[PDB]
Design a protein around this ligand. Structure first.
Ligand SMILES: CCCCCCCCCCC(=O)SCCNC(=O)CCNC(=O)[C@H](O)C(C)(C)COP(=O)(O)OP(=O)(O)OC[C@H]1O[C@@H](n2cnc3c(N)ncnc32)[C@H](O)[C@@H]1OP(=O)(O)O
Ligand SMILES: CCCCCCCCCCC(=O)SCCNC(=O)CCNC(=O)[C@H](O)C(C)(C)COP(=O)(O)OP(=O)(O)OC[C@H]1O[C@@H](n2cnc3c(N)ncnc32)[C@H](O)[C@@H]1OP(=O)(O)O
Ligand SMILES: Cc1cc2nc3c(=O)[nH]c(=O)nc-3n(C[C@H](O)[C@H](O)[C@H](O)COP(=O)(O)OP(=O)(O)OC[C@H]3O[C@@H](n4cnc5c(N)ncnc54)[C@H](O)[C@@H]3O)c2cc1C
Ligand SMILES: Cc1cc2nc3c(=O)[nH]c(=O)nc-3n(C[C@H](O)[C@H](O)[C@H](O)COP(=O)(O)OP(=O)(O)OC[C@H]3O[C@@H](n4cnc5c(N)ncnc54)[C@H](O)[C@@H]3O)c2cc1C
Lengths: 592, 593, 99
């Protein structure tokens, strides 16, 4: 008999402390302003229906969707070119959770709700955009195929193809389907190696006619996301009976195709590789080599850029939803964590420096959230056939302004947000860095900040009616100000003074006399930013001025937004042609 | 015989175009302001020696170091707890290129230059800081152990241990060695699960006396970077003969230890795991369980935090170097790409909106760069015993202001830079996203933005009149303004105005304290940023005013920095305690409690 | 207008041959001696019940189980000692197909 050795088997001791991490609360109920915004925008009976759907979905997010989106990051997509026996197969391997998320989008009507024929288009885009906002930061980038799917439905519908074109009619029905066994998603293959931003210049895919409006496509698609989708829209140059094609925009035609044939093989397509991306790693983005891909021409020949133009309001809107969802999500988690993390003897929530940093993030977020809902409201009105001329013009203006502004807010805000967790915010296993890496896609794809800033200029150039309409919309918003509150009065005076200074600069910039020494393109971003802030400020004031829903937070936020940061940051001397040569000397000093 | 089948074997055709990526040029030669700045700060003689070293190193960066740093990201460190036969070994597997980078740091005197006895201290810190600035964005995060190594040397020499204390003396000699076969690196183990910002409340490591000043450590280190290092400094609570210890800052003492013993075995340490990090993936960062780690107490008992202060400050300057390194790198790469990428029929570089966006990044980067070199200057003067009272105060003030400000500039600026490449900027296999992921460490470690803003306030709280001193420094810089250039006159009046307004605000805040309705802590970041911008502007003006080296871009940059952004953004009402209540109501609206 | 470039986009040609791999047949039906052996060992009555079960299972093997077993090799188990917040959890991660 021996001494027993049970004392020689002992788990490590590590002090017994471990920090509780942030909790994700139902994102409908927890959101500072979503429910109040919906209450103002929708009729009470619709509001009750919408809020009940959204609240229930918010519990699905916490109980199910968040975990699924996390798995889709943990088990990233792979591609196998060949099987084991020497046959080219292009096998895409995607986790089960990616598929489950797609199914959930169908069941929840993330597309459907936007087009439901029995609901007022006004109401349905507001409901839809709200639902998309709850989904996005938990979606594992299923948000991307939802965006392109909504885009596709919009494009095919606007081209008057429904009940006229067989493939387009099946696509619309299936893209809109709530049955997860039948529903489809769409991709959008526009970006090529020579350009993305510039498709008229960069697109080098050719379409050879097979029969009537059926063509075979030959080209190289440089970024093609959601290659597990069912159909795609793309652009190509039709080749004439002489073997020739046209350069530029008027050479481009729009096509619809199925990605895989009846037996699940790729339709004239090879996946050259999957991209290795900073973020959106959940999402399969491939390079595609098209060699004989069978596709149907849709819309008029030479008018493919106009054809895809139908989609820009709604794609721009989904991308802003995503920027805002990451901004809201980091704030939501950071404020929760602030109540559980003790530093210097009390929780972070109690240190005024901490709440000062978060309060400013909340102010800026709220602004752009209202801008988002203004865009949703305008889109719905346009789809109901109920827009005033001012509302139709604000739909064209707001979509690029919203996208670029929220896109440019997103990374610095998320970056600030992760720092609220200290070193933990930098740890991938927390899930927090995903928010930053994924938010960084938002100012880049579907147009960069600067490309969209130029689009804004184009919306209005030179024709002063867009700016006069913007002026009328702001005036409508400020007309409801509760000027008996000194903060809201000051806020309104600040918005008016910014809009007047904007209008004076743009009139002065358009003076025929000074075309030679003026470069409005140079200050495009400044111009777009100033629109965004004036518009968002006027919306915050209106919101705060509605006694039936506003609280004291709403007034203070309107005040801070309007009065504690510049609404306009734009000086006449920045328009000068000479300023450019000085910018170039700054940038290229000692360049080799 | 058959028809031959050569036509049936054929590579894919893919259109024939592909885009040329950006080129990294010699970063000393290609830098907009580094060489001009060294010409001004250094004596003419030292200038030549220093610039030849840096220029040569720049070719080493492009020819060798960059590729090495890239490799260290592609083959990240791994940890194996056990061998195959049931023995716990804690084997850290790091790529050959990580090791090669450390060797190059020794050979190149990235540490040594800062301490070389034959060279004037003011010169050598300028030289050292410039060299670190060239190294940092290609370093594969070898910059991190270089920071900690420099901080360790400073700490150990400041405590007057060199020539007295056995381990500290060996450590100093090895940490400074240019011999890659002998050189050492250090770590710094402060952060624990309960707190990193707050080590007084967070630290739960205990030190049990073995003999005289040698102790056994027992604790859990929650973040320990560069666990391939040879030594580390750490804090622990000394246990008295009754088995008790003191809570709070006053219970902490400083310790120096060897990470591995003479057999290469861990010294009472187990590596629990490696962190899985957003960036700095090149760097091995572990959690450490200390159970009987042998360590030597240094400095006075109870004054560990004060003892470790030189490490915090040196590492905070290195961290600013890294922030600025990422900012300059992205701008260098983006500007080169602009000459090669055609969009809408011409190169990005020809489009005014593209140059407006980059020009602003350049203006902001130059200001922080001059602040960095003013910190290097002030550090050198302090180490030479040549600091005026004002220069000593400005060293203590500038260190956290610089770190936190460049820190907070870095992610938005590198984000803007990656967008210049469009979708390609988001592709990991370009190397560009690394710059963003890595730059994101810089506002977090060695003190968050806010925590350092609070250190700025600790600076004002001792003390002597830090604000007066700051006003004196700014006026030195502004005297010799070339008021004869209209843009520089305007720039000067902008800085004076911002300084006068800050002084005024801070005077009101001291006056109102005892009422109990003022919370200067609430606005600590706004105060810190105003200091950064005032100081940076005045430096830019002084730089542009020097007609011996300044070019036209230097004047235009000073003007834009000073007159086209607010230098001060701070209002009296932000100090009020009633505003905190409003902040909470904004932040916690609908919070699920 | 330009010469079209469709001929410049073209999949690789690799000769046109590839070898067919082996086929897994119903392992009850395809086995050389299993069914003959069960016929001898089991009473005639039990034989029928047992062979129908096994034969049906054999089609389940070829249609379902084989692929599942293959997947369990392609996605091998993993162990995570700690969660992201310093708690020891010993989380075993096994593929859905194992379950
Ligand atoms: C975060 C997760 C979920 C949220 C989002 C998920 C998104 C998935 C990401 C997939 C992609 O990145 S797909 C690749 C997208 N590619 C782009 O976005 C390219 C960006 N470039 C531009 O926007 C350019 O400015 C172009 C393409 C519009 C320039 O084209 P053109 O060179 O043909 O320029 P034009 O000005 O000639 O435009 C041609 C026509 O198109 C019209 N058009 C152009 N833009 C618009 C618009 N926004 N609205 C209405 N119409 C528009 C324009 O009015 C004009 O019509 P007409 O004047 O002939 O009637
Ligand atoms: C990118 C490549 C570039 C390379 C950079 C690589 C970095 C490697 C990463 C490693 C880390 O993150 S290591 C852990 C970093 N941890 C921190 O930075 C700590 C953050 N927290 C603080 O700074 C806090 O303010 C405290 C820890 C220093 C709080 O300490 P206490 O609670 O003891 O606060 P006290 O104010 O009582 O400080 C105690 C004494 O220490 C003094 N002290 C505190 N801070 C300083 C300082 N910065 N300089 C001089 N003295 C200082 C203070 O004046 C005082 O002196 P006396 O009045 O007693 O004489
Ligand atoms: C993760 C990911 C997935 C994607 N998936 C898809 C997809 O499924 N389908 C698809 O079609 N595309 C996709 N894209 C591509 C995306 O739409 C392009 O990256 C984007 O349109 C930018 O184009 P580019 O990459 O060609 O950038 P470029 O145009 O080469 O470079 C952009 C830079 O050039 C500047 N620039 C461009 N034009 C001008 C101008 N006129 N004036 C001043 N500056 C200008 C921009 O401002 C920016 O600084 C994806 C991209 C990413 C990152
Ligand atoms: C890659 C990486 C490597 C690291 N390597 C090392 C290493 O080798 N050695 C080491 O010692 N440390 C290391 N760290 C840790 C680092 O120093 C800490 O993460 C950092 O100091 C923040 O402390 P924390 O993580 O405890 O965050 P916390 O202090 O828990 O939280 C930070 C947040 O709390 C706020 N906060 C804290 N105090 C206050 C206050 N008084 N008032 C208002 N707000 C406050 C901050 O502003 C920020 O918003 C590393 C970190 C990382 C990310």
């Amino acid at each position: 008999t021996i001494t027993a050795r049970h004392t020689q088997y002992s788990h490590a001791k590590t002090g017994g402390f471990s920090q509780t991490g942030p909790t994700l609360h139902n994102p409908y109920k927890d959101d500072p302003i979503l429910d109040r915004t919906l209450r103002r925008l929708l009729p009470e009976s619709e509001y009750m229906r919408v809020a009940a759907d959204l609240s229930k979905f918010g519990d699905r997010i916490t109980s199910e969707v968040e975990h699924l989106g996390r798995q889709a990051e943990l088990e990233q997509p792979r591609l196998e070119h060949q099987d084991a026996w020497g046959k080219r197969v292009d096998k895409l391997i995607v986790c089960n959770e990616w598929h489950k998320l797609k199914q959930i989008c169908a069941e929840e009507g993330v597309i459907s709700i936007g087009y439901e024929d029995s609901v007022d288009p006004f109401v349905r885009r507001i409901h839809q955009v709200a639902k998309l906002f709850l989904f996005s930061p938990s979606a594992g980038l299923v948000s991307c195929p939802m965006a392109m799917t909504d885009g596709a439905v919009k494009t095919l519908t606007s081209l008057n193809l429904y009940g006229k074109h067989k493939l387009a009619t099946e696509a619309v029905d299936r893209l809109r389907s709530r049955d997860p066994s039948k529903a489809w998603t769409s991709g959008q293959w526009m970006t090529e190696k020579k350009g993305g931003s510039d498709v008229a210049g960069g697109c080098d895919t050719y379409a050879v006619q097979i029969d009537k409006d059926t063509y075979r496509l030959h080209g190289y698609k440089w970024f093609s996301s959601a290659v597990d989708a069912d159909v795609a829209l793309t652009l190509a140059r039709i080749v004439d009976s002489d073997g020739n094609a046209l350069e530029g925009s008027r050479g481009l035609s729009l096509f619809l195709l199925k990605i895989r044939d009846e037996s699940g093989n790729l339709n004239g397509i090879q996946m050259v590789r999957l991209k290795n991306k900073l973020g959106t790693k959940q999402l399969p983005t491939a390079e595609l080599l098209l060699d004989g891909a069978i596709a149907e021409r849709i819309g008029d020949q030479g008018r493919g850029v106009a054809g895809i133009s139908n989609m820009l309001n709604i794609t721009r809107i989904h991308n802003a939803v995503a920027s805002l969802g990451y901004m809201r999500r980091i704030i939501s988690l950071a404020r929760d964590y602030s109540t559980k993390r003790v530093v210097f003897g009390q929780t972070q929530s109690k240190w005024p420096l901490h709440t000062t940093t978060l309060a400013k993030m909340e102010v800026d977020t709220r602004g752009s959230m209202l801008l988002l809902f203004e865009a949703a409201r305008l889109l719905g009105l346009s789809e109901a056939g109920k827009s005033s001329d001012v509302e139709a013009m604000m739909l064209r203006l707001i979509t690029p302004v919203l996208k670029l502004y929220a896109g440019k807010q997103a990374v610095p805000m998320v970056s600030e947000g992760i720092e609220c967790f200290g070193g933990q915010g930098y740890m991938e296993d927390t899930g927090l860095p995903t928010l930053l890496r994924d938010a960084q896609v938002t100012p880049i794809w579907e147009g960069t900040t600067n490309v969209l800033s130029l689009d804004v200029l184009r919306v209005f150039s030179g024709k002063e009616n867009i700016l006069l309409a913007f002026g009328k919309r702001v005036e409508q918003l400020l007309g409801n100000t509760k000027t008996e509150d000194e903060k809201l009065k000051k806020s309104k005076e600040a918005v008016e003074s910014a809009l007047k200074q904007l209008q004076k600069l743009l009139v002065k910039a358009s003076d025929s006399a000074i075309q030679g020494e003026t470069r409005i393109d140079s200050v495009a971003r400044h111009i777009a930013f100033t629109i965004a802030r004036i518009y968002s400020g006027a919306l915050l004031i209106d919101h705060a001025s509605d006694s039936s829903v506003a609280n004291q937070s709403d007034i203070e936020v309107a005040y801070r937004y309007c009065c504690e940061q510049p609404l306009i940051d734009l000086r006449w001397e920045w328009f000068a042609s000479e300023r450019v040569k000085a910018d170039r000397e700054i940038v290229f000093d000692n360049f080799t």
